[PDB]
Amino acid sequence: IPVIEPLFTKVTEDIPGAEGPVFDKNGDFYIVAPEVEVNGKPAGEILRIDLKTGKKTVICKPEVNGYGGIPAGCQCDRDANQLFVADMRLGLLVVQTDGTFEEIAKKDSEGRRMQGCNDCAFDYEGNLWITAPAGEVAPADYTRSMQEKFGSIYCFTTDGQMIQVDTAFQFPDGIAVRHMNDGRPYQLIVAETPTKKLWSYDIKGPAKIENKKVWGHIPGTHEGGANGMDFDEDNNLLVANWGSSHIEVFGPDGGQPKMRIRCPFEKPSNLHFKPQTKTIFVTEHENNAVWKFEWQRNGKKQYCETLKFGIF
Ligand SMILES: [Ca+2]
Ligand SMILES: [Ca+2]
């Protein structure tokens, strides 16, 4: 397997549990610090980063009824410049650029308690697919499915339904939607960290997935595995392999990686392309910092970059 060593440039530092890098509709850059704590209690933050100075601005420090959040993953909406944030303690949140937020669901469509979420990914239809490796959201005691298979997957539909689409995962983490060349969603890829596996489903429609299949294998025997992920414009899936010092590059069909990217750190946690560029911003937990490097090509256009009222 060929391996490349591009130059990684420091972007910002000192972000506890650096994670969920994302760009909004204005091109502003954000990341989350899920592990910031106050008196040992969860006090996660959502930060805006000045790409030119690297200076940090905490725009939101979520909390519901006294319970602080553990914001871990993000996706920028299209129909409004707002961020959907997966939170390990509060579930799904919608965060405005002004820092105000709202908790989306305390229970799912079947009336069962919502679970803590980790990452999410919009399909071009506007449906948000979410991973939920944690147990019930606050005020329930904090737990994670690293050892027991109770992690779940959700789909938040355009009509506002929070539907659990599957469960029994051992820490579902990164997630991504593979689209047909004409833009139709048809494959959901889910990372299950400890098992060193990438799972896929055939997307049949909103909150409808079938045929769970082992899609790809993550290299290494180290503690950790697939964390965050994203597709480039050719539909190659780049996955942060936490603990391996590499970002794995899978081809459209999966299987084994067809290439690897060596990082100047051991724990890449998540990544995200800057719109209209080949630049990938990476969050990592060895130094709790954010970096950037140039990929061989541009990233797959995110849902927020598409036009709802376009002709084509
Ligand atoms: Ca993650
Ligand atoms: Ca990303």
Side-chain angles (χ1 to χ4, degrees):
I1 302 176
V3 178
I4 69 173
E5 285 191 296
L7 167 68
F8 281 63
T9 300
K10 181 66 59 56
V11 177
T12 192
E13 302 180 303
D14 296 299
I15 298 82
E19 172 73 275
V22 65
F23 282 92
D24 69 14
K25 296 160 73 76
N26 297 314
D28 281 316
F29 186 55
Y30 307 78
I31 59 178
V32 290
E35 279 155 49
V36 175
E37 288 175 28
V38 168
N39 294 167
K41 248 67 178 62
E45 315 177 315
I46 298 165
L47 302 52
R48 175 175 286 130
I49 306 293
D50 181 303
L51 288 185
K52 288 185 179 183
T53 68
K55 285 180 179 179
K56 302 169 289 178
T57 293
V58 175
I59 70 165
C60 184
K61 193 178 186 67
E63 69 71 50
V64 185
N65 303 310
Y67 295 90
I70 296 179
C74 320
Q75 281 294 91
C76 185
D77 188 21
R78 175 187 69 181
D79 301 353
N81 192 208
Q82 54 185 12
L83 304 178
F84 277 76
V85 181
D87 188 301
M88 292 290 268
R89 286 297 283 160
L90 302 169
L92 182 66
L93 315 175
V94 190
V95 183
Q96 305 299 141
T97 51
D98 68 0
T100 55
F101 78 98
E102 298 303 313
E103 183 176 50
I104 289 182
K106 287 185 181 294
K107 291 188 174 184
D108 61 32
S109 65
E110 292 297 306
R112 43 204 173 196
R113 274 97 49 168
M114 184 62 184
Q115 279 173 252
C117 301
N118 182 291
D119 210 341
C120 53
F122 274 120
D123 62 31
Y124 289 144
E125 283 291 285
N127 299 301
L128 184 68
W129 303 85
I130 316 153
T131 55
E136 286 172 48
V137 295
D141 193 47
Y142 185 58
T143 63
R144 37 175 171 288
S145 52
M146 265 298 180
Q147 313 175 322
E148 311 299 306
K149 299 181 173 178
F150 60 80
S152 304
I153 305 301
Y154 294 85
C155 180
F156 181 58
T157 63
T158 58
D159 61 315
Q161 284 193 283
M162 180 59 78
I163 305 176
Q164 194 186 78
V165 291
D166 204 9
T167 191
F169 274 93
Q170 201 184 325
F171 207 97
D173 203 313
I175 184 167
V177 177
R178 182 190 186 192
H179 297 89
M180 296 284 262
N181 297 299
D182 77 307
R184 187 176 70 72
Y186 77 110
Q187 199 171 65
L188 175 77
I189 302 178
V190 182
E192 182 178 51
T193 314
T195 61
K196 300 300 190 297
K197 292 176 186 169
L198 290 191
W199 300 87
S200 77
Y201 294 82
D202 289 320
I203 296 181
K204 296 300 180 184
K208 292 186 177 182
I209 52 182
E210 315 186 317
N211 306 311
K212 179 183 181 183
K213 303 181 177 181
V214 172
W215 186 82
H217 297 288
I218 301 292
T221 45
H222 56 289
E223 281 309 295
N227 200 143
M229 63 175 67
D230 268 330
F231 280 110
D232 64 15
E233 64 178 53
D234 290 343
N235 297 314
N236 294 140
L237 184 71
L238 287 80
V239 188
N241 190 174
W242 198 96
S244 71
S245 299
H246 296 71
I247 287 173
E248 315 299 333
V249 180
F250 291 85
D253 302 304
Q256 293 283 166
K258 62 170 177 180
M259 196 188 117
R260 312 188 79 200
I261 302 165
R262 184 60 184 256
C263 301
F265 38 78
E266 185 185 64
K267 302 161 178 175
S269 59
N270 218 145
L271 50 73
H272 202 78
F273 285 85
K274 183 179 176 188
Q276 302 293 152
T277 78
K278 301 183 188 304
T279 311
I280 295 181
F281 288 65
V282 183
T283 52
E284 54 95 345
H285 299 159
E286 186 176 307
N287 306 96
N288 284 313
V290 180
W291 311 65
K292 68 182 180 189
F293 74 92
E294 301 297 292
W295 178 223
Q296 310 189 315
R297 65 187 63 67
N298 286 55
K300 186 75 174 197
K301 189 178 291 180
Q302 287 268 139
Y303 171 60
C304 64
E305 300 173 56
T306 63
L307 292 182
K308 172 180 174 58
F309 298 111
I311 293 186
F312 274 20

